[PDB]
Design an enzyme around this catalytic site. Sequence first.
Site, PDB file in Angstrom:
ATOM      1  N   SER A  61       0.755  -1.250   0.000  1.00 25.60           N
ATOM      2  CA  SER A  61       0.000   0.000   0.000  1.00 25.60           C
ATOM      3  C   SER A  61       0.786   1.300   0.000  1.00 25.60           C
ATOM      4  O   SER A  61       0.210   2.353  -0.238  1.00 25.60           O
ATOM      5  CB  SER A  61      -0.998   0.049   1.161  1.00 25.60           C
ATOM      6  N   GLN A 117     -10.784  -5.600  -1.202  1.00 20.17           N
ATOM      7  CA  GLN A 117     -10.145  -6.279  -2.312  1.00 20.17           C
ATOM      8  C   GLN A 117     -11.027  -6.446  -3.521  1.00 20.17           C
ATOM      9  O   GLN A 117     -12.245  -6.604  -3.408  1.00 20.17           O
ATOM     10  CB  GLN A 117      -9.674  -7.677  -1.885  1.00 20.17           C
ATOM     11  N   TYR A 147     -11.173   1.600   4.029  1.00 15.63           N
ATOM     12  CA  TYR A 147      -9.935   1.433   3.300  1.00 15.63           C
ATOM     13  C   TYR A 147     -10.105   0.386   2.225  1.00 15.63           C
ATOM     14  O   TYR A 147     -10.488  -0.753   2.511  1.00 15.63           O
ATOM     15  CB  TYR A 147      -8.817   1.033   4.275  1.00 15.63           C
ATOM     16  N   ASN A 149      -8.650  -1.237  -1.786  1.00 15.85           N
ATOM     17  CA  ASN A 149      -7.901  -1.254  -3.024  1.00 15.85           C
ATOM     18  C   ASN A 149      -8.851  -1.052  -4.230  1.00 15.85           C
ATOM     19  O   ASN A 149      -8.442  -0.491  -5.249  1.00 15.85           O
ATOM     20  CB  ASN A 149      -7.216  -2.587  -3.210  1.00 15.85           C
ATOM     21  N   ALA A 308       1.859  -3.346   2.908  1.00 19.06           N
ATOM     22  CA  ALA A 308       2.239  -4.726   3.016  1.00 19.06           C
ATOM     23  C   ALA A 308       1.838  -5.526   1.813  1.00 19.06           C
ATOM     24  O   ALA A 308       1.058  -5.056   0.994  1.00 19.06           O
ATOM     25  CB  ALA A 308       1.619  -5.343   4.292  1.00 19.06           C
ATOM     26  N   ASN A 333       6.006  -9.348   6.421  1.00 20.93           N
ATOM     27  CA  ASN A 333       4.862  -8.503   6.786  1.00 20.93           C
ATOM     28  C   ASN A 333       4.703  -8.718   8.305  1.00 20.93           C
ATOM     29  O   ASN A 333       4.268  -9.777   8.723  1.00 20.93           O
ATOM     30  CB  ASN A 333       3.614  -8.987   5.994  1.00 20.93           C
TER      31      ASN A 333
HETATM   32  O1  LIG Z   1      -1.339 -11.801   0.308  1.00 22.08           O
HETATM   33  C1  LIG Z   1      -1.393 -10.961   1.212  1.00 22.08           C
HETATM   34  O2  LIG Z   1      -1.464 -11.361   2.492  1.00 22.08           O
HETATM   35  C2  LIG Z   1      -1.376  -9.485   0.871  1.00 22.08           C
HETATM   36  C3  LIG Z   1      -1.433  -8.502   1.930  1.00 22.08           C
HETATM   37  C4  LIG Z   1      -1.410  -7.105   1.606  1.00 22.08           C
HETATM   38  C5  LIG Z   1      -1.329  -6.681   0.218  1.00 22.08           C
HETATM   39  N1  LIG Z   1      -1.290  -5.288  -0.094  1.00 22.08           N
HETATM   40  S1  LIG Z   1      -2.765  -4.337  -0.041  1.00 22.08           S
HETATM   41  O3  LIG Z   1      -3.715  -5.015  -0.859  1.00 22.08           O
HETATM   42  O4  LIG Z   1      -2.481  -3.013  -0.572  1.00 22.08           O
HETATM   43  C6  LIG Z   1      -3.467  -4.208   1.680  1.00 22.08           C
HETATM   44  C7  LIG Z   1      -4.721  -4.721   2.052  1.00 22.08           C
HETATM   45  C8  LIG Z   1      -4.936  -4.455   3.410  1.00 22.08           C
HETATM   46  S2  LIG Z   1      -3.812  -3.761   3.918  1.00 22.08           S
HETATM   47  C9  LIG Z   1      -2.888  -3.605   2.831  1.00 22.08           C
HETATM   48  C10 LIG Z   1      -1.565  -2.922   2.948  1.00 22.08           C
HETATM   49  O5  LIG Z   1      -0.745  -2.827   1.905  1.00 22.08           O
HETATM   50  O6  LIG Z   1      -1.239  -2.441   4.042  1.00 22.08           O
HETATM   51  C11 LIG Z   1      -1.277  -7.672  -0.841  1.00 22.08           C
HETATM   52  O7  LIG Z   1      -1.200  -7.283  -2.154  1.00 22.08           O
HETATM   53  C12 LIG Z   1      -1.301  -9.068  -0.519  1.00 22.08           C
END
Ligand SMILES: O=C(O)c1ccc(NS(=O)(=O)c2ccsc2C(=O)O)c(O)c1
Length: 351
Positions: A61, A117, A147, A149, A308, A333
């Site tokens: 993120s 998501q 929050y 994506n 993350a 992470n």
């Molecule tokens: O596979 C995973 O556990 C995973 C976790 C976060 C992630 N990145 S993310 O989708 O941007 C996200 C969702 C919730 S928090 C966050 C963040 O970046 O802080 C991703 O693309 C995959």
Amino acid sequence: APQQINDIVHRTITPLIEQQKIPGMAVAVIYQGKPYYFTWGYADIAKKQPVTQQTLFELGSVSKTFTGVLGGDAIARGEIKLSDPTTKYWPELTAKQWNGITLLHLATYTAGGLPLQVPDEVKSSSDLLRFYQNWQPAWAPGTQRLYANSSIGLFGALAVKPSGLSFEQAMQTRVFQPLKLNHTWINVPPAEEKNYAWGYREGKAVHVSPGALDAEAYGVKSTIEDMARWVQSNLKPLDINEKTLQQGIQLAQSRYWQTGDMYQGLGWEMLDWPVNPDSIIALAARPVKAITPPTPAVRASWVHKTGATGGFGSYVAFIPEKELGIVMLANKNYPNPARVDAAWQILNALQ
Ligand SMILES: O=C(O)c1ccc(NS(=O)(=O)c2ccsc2C(=O)O)c(O)c1
């Protein structure tokens, strides 16, 4: 580096790495506008490759801060407006729940409950359209922050449509290149693969999987030097030559909404400085108060973003007023509170 910076950094990070069992980490502290780098451990445990100043980490993120500034640049160019209806840039989005949802709502997670998501089964352009058309909001736009994506990811994709460039092309030409982020990528080129650290999840080496709107919501990979430079740019936007880019950075740090002590920018999130470190869950719906009109970037702020991926954990935070900032990139992470605690310990000691 000055012994003081050397000492607070090592004393804070070394215990963090062993408590969290982080395979590798890189940290940059920007002090009085200059960067100081530190690295520990491994980029690739199996191949015994160390973390260096050229190692690439998945930002997760923290990528949203680049998306927000790129969107900000498009606004500065006169190509889009945050007050514009989403349907203006995506005509086939005819479902009636969209009347009233603007690019602002998409950029700031306030559209009315778009999900965190984009479903894994959405893997085609028509799939994406179907998904947004069938989405049913839980709330009216501009009332609650969730929050997501699927929210800022869509803002990114629509923001570059007038330009005609793909999201990656626009990011490279309008943000990475002007800022000299020559080792920051949405897609890591084979030439840079030997520097791409592996992420670690439950002991397994992993890299982020492809997904709809990944580029726009969590797809940037970068080095500690380029991230330090990203912080310098955000600390002093007025020092940037490119006029629309300079303004785009300021727009991303403007305060659009408030929830508790936090203010939502484009990608970036802010709190007034000094902050209570205490004030700095899979889904948290929070009512927001609109800031009408948005407050322009406030120098006395703690500006930050956590990020993350399955195998990485990042954090960036800076205080304009103090020309102070920090970037922490890890290939594991680990808990966000641990990130923010170490960041505050370091920056508070140097302010
Ligand atoms: O596979 C995973 O556990 C995973 C976790 C976060 C992630 N990145 S993310 O989708 O941007 C996200 C969702 C919730 S928090 C966050 C963040 O970046 O802080 C991703 O693309 C995959």
